[PDB]
C-alpha cells in the first residue's frame, strides 16, 4: 500500500530510493533453476541497436 | 512535441541444453555438501569453489547436473491442460505411463528407416523383441537401431518432440477442425483441443523455442548463496543419477525422473514427498509462488527526538563536521557523535533544516524539528521514517508530498483536514450565540453599544461582558451578515424624515432627507472572535508573503 | 480475470498463479515492453508516471606590430 | 439474425457493452450511496472500462 | 437473396 501511495503522488525518484538490483538479479537465478531465461534488452531510440543488460 | 522514446523489453523463453552449459562453464557430480572434518566445501560438490567461486560470485554463478537419462519438465507434462500431450495429440494417461509406468512406445520417430510393424503404446513387453531380434542382429548391432523401432521413458517423448513436423500439425488440425464443423459435449471439446494445438505449433515456428526443450537433458543448479530443502532435493537427484550411470534400470530412470519432478514442482503427483519430520518438501514452484500529539505544531512540521534524528541524519552530521573542520576525517567525526560532544547537536539542527522526511495519506512529508524528550511529536491532524538522499527525491518530498498541497481528497474533492473533536466543540461553543425568548427573559417584555469590534473584545477581556451576552456592533462595511431573508419586524418612522428598520439581527438607520445608512449588528463577542480570527489569518498571511 | 489477461506477463506472474503464467509465456517467448507501473517496480527502475513520465585561435598572434 | 457481416457483431457488441456499463456503474454506486460514501463516477468508470 | 457488403441495405434494416 505504501508503494501505491507513492505512485499516486507521482514521486518516481522517492519510490526508486525506497526500493534500492539484488531483488531482480536473484529472481533471474531462481528462474534459471526452472530452465527459464529472463533477458533484459534495451533498444536504442537513436540507432536501433539492442543491448543486453548485465543481469 | 516528440515523445522521449524509451524502448526496453524483457522476455522469458525455454532454455536449450547448450545455454544451460554456457551458464555454468561447472558440472556438479557429487552429493556432498560440506566436509565433516575440515568443515570445507567438498570438491565437485554442491558448494565446490571451482564451480561456484571462493568462500560474491557464489550468489550468481550457476552449475548443472548432467542427467544420464532425459527427464520431462513437470510444468509441461502434468499441469492441466498438458502442453506435451496437446502437441503430440496423445492423452496424458497414455503418455504418463511412458514416464512413470512400465510401458514402451513403438515407432517414436518417422524420419529414419524402420522395418517393424509395431506402433503405439505397449503396456506389456514384446516377446520376440526380448530374445529373437537381439540374437538375430547381435547385441552390438541391435543397439544402433534399437531406439528407432520402440523406445521407453522420457527419452522416447523427446524423440517424438524433436521429430515433429510443426507445419503438418497445423494442416492436419485445420482439416479435422472443419470436418467436425460440417457435422455434443465431445465435438466442442475436440474443436478446442485442435485450436490449442495449432496455436501452439504456430508459436514454435515463429520463435526460437524448440519443443524438445520441454524434456530436460541437463539440470541447472541454483547458486549456493541462494540455498545456504532445496539442497536435500539436489542431493537426492544427484544420488540417483550417479546410481543410474553405475548400472550402465528402467525402475532407476523412474527414480531419477520422479526426483526431478519433486525438485521442480512438488504437489503435482498426489501425496508429495515428505522428510523424516513429516514436512512436505518445497520445490521451486512453491518458492516462486511512540507517537505523541503536539497541538502547537504547524501542519507541515513534525518533531523528532535527538536519539532518532542523529541516526537518521548521521551521514549529514559527519559531512557537516568535516566541512566546518570540527572533525579531521570520517573516523574522528564518528567519535564526537559517539561521545555526545555538544557541537554535534548544533550541526544536527543545521543539516535538519530544509531537509524533509517521510513518515509512514498514510505516508506524508514533513519538515522535522528537534524536540525535547524521546517521542515523535505529530500535529493533531495526523513507525517508519525515511530521509530522502538525492536532490531528485528531496525535490519530490518538498514539492509534491507536503501537507498543504494535498488539502483535497481525490475521491470527491472534499477537504482532508477539517477540525474535529475538541477543535469542533470549541468553535461550536464560541459561535453558539445568546439565549433567546423564554430562555432569555422570565417574563414577556410586553444592551451595550460598541463603536468597533476591538472595543467589544476589550470589554470581554476586562470581564465586562460574557462570551454569549448580546451586544450591538457599529458596522462600517457592507451588509454581509448571513441572516434569514425577512422584512423588518418593526419600522420606526420619525416625522422629520429619519426611520429605523429593526430586523431580527441588525438595525438599519436611513433618512428621506440625507443619504445616510448606518448599520448596527446584534451579535456576541463569540461571533466577532470567529470573524476576526479568519480575517486576521488572511491579513497576516498576505503581509508575510 | 482481467488482471490475468494483460500485456505484461511480469504483472500477471506477480499477481496470481505465477507458475501457470510463466510456463505459458516461456513456451512462446513472450515479450514484456514494460509500459505499466508494477512492471518497472519489480525491475527497480523509474516508473513511467509522475516525475518519471516521458523520461523525466585566430585574431591572436595577428595584431598590429606598431 | 437481423444484421449482416461486421454489423450484427459490431452493433450487437455495442448494445451489450453500453448496457453492461450503465448497469455496472449503477450497481456499484447503489452500494456506496446507501452507505453515505460519495465517490466520483470517474473512478468507477475507469474500473468498469 | 444475399446482401453481403451492401451497407445501404443494412442501414435501412438498422432503421
Measured between CB atoms, does A25 come within 8 Å of chain B?
Answer: yes
Q: How far is C39 from chain A (nearest CA, A)?
A: 11
Asked if B71 contacts B154 with a C-beta cutoff of 8 angstroms, the reply is yes
What's C12-52 look like in SS3? HHCCCCHHHHHHHHHHHCCEECCCCHHHHHHHCCCCCCHHH
Q: Which residues pair with D20 in a beta bridge?
A: none
Please tell me the experimental approach by which this structure was elucidated. cryo-EM
Beta B385-386 vs B357-359: how paired, if at all?
antiparallel
Out of C18, C34, C51, whose CB is closest to B10?
C34
Measured between CB atoms, does B311 come within 8 Å of chain D?
Answer: no
What are B523's three cell numbers?
A: 451579535
Q: Which of B54, B170, B63, B156 is nearest to B107 (CA)?
A: B156
Side-chain-facing half-sphere of B288: CA atoms under 13 Å: 29
Asked if B393 contacts A14 with a C-beta cutoff of 8 angstroms, the reply is yes
User: What residue has cell string 473533536?
Assistant: B421
Chain C residues near residue B75 by CB distance under 8 angstroms: 19, 23
User: What residue has cell string 503522488?
Assistant: A9
Question: Strands of B301-304's sheet, edge to edge?
Answer: B291-293, B376-378, B301-304, B364-370, B357-359, B385-386
Interface of E with D (CB under 8 A): 3-6, 9-10, 13-14
CB pairs A-C closer than 8 Å: 45
Chain C residues near residue A7 by CB distance under 8 angstroms: 37, 47, 49-50
Answer whether C26 sits within 8 Å of B13, measured CB to CB: yes
User: What residue has cell string 558448494?
Assistant: B47
Do chains C and B meet with 3 or more Cβ pairs nearer than 8 Å?
yes
Chain C residues near residue A11 by CB distance under 8 angstroms: 50-51
Side-chain-facing half-sphere of A5: CA atoms under 13 Å: 15
CA distance B252 to B244: 6
What are B298's three cell numbers?
A: 504547524
Do chains E and B meet with 3 or more Cβ pairs nearer than 8 Å?
no
Chain E residues near residue D3 by CB distance under 8 angstroms: 10, 13-14
Out of B20, B389, B392, whose CB is closest to A35?
B20
User: What residue has cell string 410586553?
Assistant: B446
What are D3's three cell numbers?
A: 444484421
* Rg of chain A on CA atoms, in Å: 15
Amino acid at each position: 500500500m505504501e508503494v501505491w501511495a507513492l505512485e499516486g503522488f507521482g514521486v518516481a525518484h522517492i519510490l526508486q530510493e525506497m526500493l534500492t538490483p539484488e531483488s531482480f538479479r536473484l529472481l533471474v537465478r531462481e528462474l534459471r533453476s526452472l530452465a527459464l531465461e529472463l533477458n533484459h534488452f534495451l533498444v536504442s531510440e537513436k540507432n536501433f541497436q539492442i543491448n543486453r543488460k548485465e543481469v | 512535441m516528440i515523445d522521449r522514446y524509451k524502448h526496453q523489453q524483457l522476455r522469458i523463453g525455454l532454455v536449450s541444453p547448450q545455454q544451460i552449459s554456457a551458464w555454468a562453464t561447472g558440472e556438479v557430480t557429487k552429493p556432498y555438501t560440506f566436509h565433516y572434518k575440515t568443515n570445507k566445501p567438498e570438491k565437485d560438490g554442491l558448494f565446490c569453489e571451482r564451480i561456484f567461486g571462493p568462500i560474491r560470485i557464489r550468489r550468481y554463478q550457476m552449475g548443472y547436473i548432467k542427467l544420464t537419462c532425459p527427464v520431462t519438465h513437470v510444468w509441461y507434462l502434468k499441469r492441466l491442460p498438458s502442453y506435451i500431450a496437446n502437441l503430440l495429440d496423445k492423452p496424458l494417461k497414455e503418455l504418463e505411463g511412458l514416464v512413470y509406468c512400465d510401458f514402451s512406445f513403438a515407432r517414436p520417430i518417422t524420419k529414419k528407416p524402420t522395418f517393424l510393424r509395431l506402433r503405439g503404446s505397449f503396456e506389456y513387453e514384446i516377446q520376440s523383441w526380448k530374445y529373437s531380434i537381439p540374437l538375430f542382429f547381435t547385441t552390438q548391432g541391435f543397439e544402433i537401431f534399437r531406439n528407432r523401432e520402440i523406445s521407453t521413458g522420457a527419452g522416447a517423448i523427446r524423440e517424438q518432440l524433436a521429430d515433429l513436423d510443426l507445419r503438418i500439425i497445423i494442416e492436419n488440425s485445420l482439416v479435422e477442425w472443419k470436418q467436425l464443423g460440417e457435422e455434443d459435449r465431445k465435438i466442442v471439446r475436440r474443436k478446442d483441443f485442435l485450436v490449442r494445438r495449432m496455436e501452439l505449433a504456430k508459436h514454435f515456428i515463429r520463435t526460437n523455442i524448440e519443443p524438445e526443450w520441454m524434456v530436460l537433458c541437463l539440470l541447472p543448479v541454483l547458486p549456493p548463496e541462494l540455498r545456504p530443502d532445496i539442497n536435500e532435493l539436489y542431493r537426492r537427484v544427484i544420488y540417483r543419477n550417479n546410481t543410474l550411470t553405475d548400472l550402465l534400470v528402467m525402475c532407476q530412470e523412474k527414480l531419477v525422473q520422479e526426483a526431478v519432478d519433486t525438485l521442480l514442482d512438488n504437489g503435482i503427483r498426489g501425496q508429495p514427498m515428505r522428510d523424516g519430520h513429516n514436512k512436505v518438501y518445497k520445490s521451486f514452484s512453491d518458492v516462486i509462488e511512540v507517537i505523541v500529539v503536539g497541538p502547537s505544531l504547524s501542519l507541515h512540521r513534525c518533531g523528532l527526538p535527538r536519539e532518532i534524528a542523529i541516526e537518521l541524519f548521521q551521514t549529514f552530521v559527519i559531512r557537516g563536521l568535516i566541512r566546518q573542520h570540527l572533525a579531521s576525517n570520517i573516523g574522528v567525526a564518528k567519535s564526537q557523535i559517539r561521545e555526545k560532544k555538544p557541537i554535534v547537536w548544533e550541526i544536527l539542527q543545521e543539516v535538519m533544516q530544509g531537509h524533509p522526511v517521510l513518515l509512514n495519506l498514510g505516508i506524508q512529508s514533513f519538515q522535522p524539528i528537534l524536540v525535547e524528550g524521546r517521542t515523535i511529536c505529530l500535529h493533531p491532524l495526523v513507525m517508519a521514517v525515511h530521509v530522502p538522499l538525492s536532490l531528485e527525491a528531496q525535490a519530490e518530498a518538498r514539492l509534491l508530498m507536503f501537507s498543504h498541497m494535498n488539502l483535497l481528497s481525490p475521491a470527491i474533492g472534499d477537504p482532508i483536514s477539517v477540525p474535529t473533536q475538541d477543535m469542533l466543540i470549541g468553535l461550536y461553543v464560541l459561535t453558539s450565540g445568546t439565549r433567546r425568548g423564554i430562555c432569555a427573559n422570565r417574563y414577556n417584555p410586553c444592551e451595550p453599544f460598541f463603536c468597533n469590534s476591538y472595543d467589544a473584545i476589550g470589554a470581554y477581556r476586562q470581564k465586562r461582558i460574557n462570551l454569549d451576552s448580546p451586544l450591538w456592533l457599529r458596522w462600517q462595511l457592507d451588509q454581509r451578515v448571513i441572516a434569514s431573508k425577512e422584512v423588518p419586524i418593526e419600522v420606526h418612522y420619525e416625522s422629520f424624515g429619519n426611520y429605523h428598520e429593526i430586523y431580527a439581527h441588525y438595525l438599519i438607520v436611513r433618512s428621506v432627507k440625507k443619504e445616510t445608512l448606518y448599520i448596527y449588528i446584534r451579535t456576541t463577542v463569540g461571533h466577532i472572535s470567529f470573524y476576526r480570527e479568519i480575517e486576521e489569518a488572511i491579513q497576516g498571511f498576505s503581509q508575510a508573503c | 480475470r482481467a488482471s490475468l489477461n494483460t500485456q505484461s506477463f511480469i504483472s500477471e506472474a506477480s499477481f496470481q498463479e505465477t507458475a501457470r503464467v510463466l510456463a505459458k509465456a516461456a513456451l512462446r517467448g513472450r515479450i514484456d515492453w514494460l509500459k505499466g507501473l508494477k512492471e518497472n517496480v519489480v525491475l527497480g527502475g523509474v516508473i513511467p508516471a509522475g516525475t518519471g513520465f516521458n523520461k523525466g585561435d585566430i585574431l591572436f598572434y595577428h595584431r598590429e606590430f606598431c | 439474425r437481423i444484421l449482416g457481416i461486421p454489423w450484427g457483431f459490431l452493433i450487437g457488441a455495442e448494445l451489450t457493452i453500453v448496457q453492461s456499463r450503465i448497469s455496472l456503474v449503477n450497481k456499484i454506486q447503489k452500494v456506496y450511496r446507501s452507505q453515505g460514501v460519495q465517490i466520483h463516477n470517474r473512478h468507477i468508470e475507469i474500473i468498469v472500462r | 437473396k444475399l446482401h453481403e457488403g451492401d451497407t445501404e441495405f443494412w442501414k435501412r434494416r438498422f432503421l
